[PDB]
């Protein structure tokens, strides 16, 4: 898939896609420098470096560093995502929405539109909530000189955030349409990796100075490479199920052609469950953390802190669960068996029909567990590595690595899979 990487910069169409993507991401990053009126960014950054502010870390990380500078997209593309989750929940809870999801042409469009509308509304709600519970709280703690905690400021913030995430959702969809990879995933990706290089340079400077010893740093780096290589290997891994084509009935017995196989990945392609797990983890923190004067809500919020043992455990569980469920939904044995049926293929020793689906379902359900567990391991280990090396960075957290490698692999996989179809 390196060939895909270079061809995407070589081939005019794909390089147009790349340039457009880079342009949009440039617009987003630039948009990170446009502040919400009335907000004192200095005090926000000051608070985010305090002990109680640390819990906002992940919230900032997935905001693309925007929450830190409280830009027009203060929470990033995250509101939309949240809505999506909600929608999904409804779809799997309300039977009417499930029917609407399975109608075909229209319905999925209606659900998606509801997701977009709900996303914007969510950005409105979150803008208001943050304006009233955190920004103007404590006698207008994070306000600017000349601003007071009232309905005018709330109105301003709400408007800013609504228009902001509207524009950002639009930008994401335009990346999806006229650029490489998926828009949302690339926006989160950019929002995460934008912080990597300066942190590397800073840490290196600290090594030269003497605050960080070289051994811990080398372990950190080597562990990152290990993470990349490991995720790559597991993504490239597959369970082969022996099948046969050109089946002919001779002497009242079923025979087949040359023995082949169908490959089944440990995990279904997609960084989406990681996004959903992250957002789900972010909800209680978002609801509880703003209230700085309430030890209870601070306790609840810090309980889900991905840096702390409890929150990290919860995060691991969320990643494993969401991955396993998503892989279960994507790898439906019925459509696989029917795909083997339309091509005139069969499983040697297994009768066609429902027993075949049973065989496939059994193998898949027993298999994908390990991929889920692996993603959970990748979720877990980096925090320990940071604790042992003394080099802490939420951007290089297990969840962050999962995002980066996930998006990279997805984009390259799609590009390769499409240029392959172009060549043939």
């Amino acid at each position: 898939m390196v060939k895909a990487f270079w061809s995407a910069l070589q081939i005019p169409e794909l390089r147009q896609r790349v340039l457009f993507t880079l342009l949009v991401l440039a617009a987003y990053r630039l948009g990170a420098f446009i502040p919400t009126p009335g907000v004192d960014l200095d005090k926000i950054q000051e608070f985010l470096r305090t002990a109680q502010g640390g819990v906002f870390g992940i919230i900032n990380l997935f905001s693309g560093g925007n929450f830190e500078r409280f830009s027009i997209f203060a929470l990033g593309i995250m509101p939309y995502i949240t809505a999506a989750i909600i929608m999904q929940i409804l779809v799997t809870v309300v039977p009417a929405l499930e029917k609407l999801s399975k109608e075909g042409e229209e319905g999925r469009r209606i659900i998606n539109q509801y997701t977009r509308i709900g996303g914007i509304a969510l950005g409105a709600f979150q803008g208001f909530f943050l304006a009233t519970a955190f920004l103007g709280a404590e006698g207008g703690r994070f306000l600017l000189p000349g601003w007071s905690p009232g309905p005018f400021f709330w109105f301003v913030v709400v408007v800013t955030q609504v228009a902001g995430i509207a524009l950002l959702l639009w930008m994401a969809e335009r990346i999806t349409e006229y650029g490489i990879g998926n828009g949302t995933s690339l926006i989160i990706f950019a929002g995460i990796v934008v912080e990597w290089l300066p942190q590397i340079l800073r840490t290196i400077g600290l090594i030269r100075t003497g605050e960080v010893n070289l051994v811990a740093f080398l372990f950190f780096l080597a562990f990152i490479v290990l993470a990349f290589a490991g995720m790559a290997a597991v993504q490239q891994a597959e369970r082969r199920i022996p099948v046969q084509y050109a089946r002919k009935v001779v002497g009242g017995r079923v025979y087949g052609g040359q023995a082949t196989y169908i490959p089944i990945k440990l995990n279904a392609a997609g960084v989406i469950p990681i996004i959903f797990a992250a957002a789900i983890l972010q909800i209680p923190i978002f609801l509880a953390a703003p209230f700085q004067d309430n030890p209870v809500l601070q306790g609840i919020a810090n309980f889900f802190n991905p840096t702390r043992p409890s929150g990290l455990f919860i995060e691991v569980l969320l990643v494993i669960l969401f991955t396993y469920v998503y892989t279960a939904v994507q790898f439906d044995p019925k459509r696989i068996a029917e795909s083997l049926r339309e091509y005139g293929g069969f499983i040697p020793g297994i009768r066609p029909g429902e027993p075949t689906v049973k065989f496939l379902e059994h193998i898949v359900s027993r298999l994908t567990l390990w991929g889920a567990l692996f993603l959970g391991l990748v979720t877990l280990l980096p925090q320990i590595i940071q604790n042992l090396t003394g080099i802490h960075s939420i951007a290089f957290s297990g969840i962050g690595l999962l995002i980066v490698v996930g998006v990279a692999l997805d984009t390259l996989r799609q590009v390769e899979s499409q240029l392959m179809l172009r060549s043939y």
């Binding site: 898939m1 895909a4 990349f228 790559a232 369970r239 390990w370 990279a408 692999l409």
Partner: protein, 60 residues
């Protein structure tokens, strides 16, 4: 029941034993690809916020 999941674990372990792992060239390929991608966007975004903060700093 505990027996159900303690059986599920064994069967899943058996399926783990039947996993076809990728070649060396595949892992090298994937890792190199990931590195190129990540590094590329790191550099590009780096130039973005560099030029941006330099121009904004110029405006003062």
């Amino acid at each position: 029941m505990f027996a159900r999941l303690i059986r599920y674990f064994q069967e899943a372990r058996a399926e783990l034993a039947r996993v076809t792992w990728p070649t060396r060239e595949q892992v090298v390929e994937g890792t190199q690809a990931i590195l190129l991608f990540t590094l590329a966007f790191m550099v590009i975004l780096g130039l973005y916020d560099t030029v941006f903060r330099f121009l904004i700093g110029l405006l003062r």
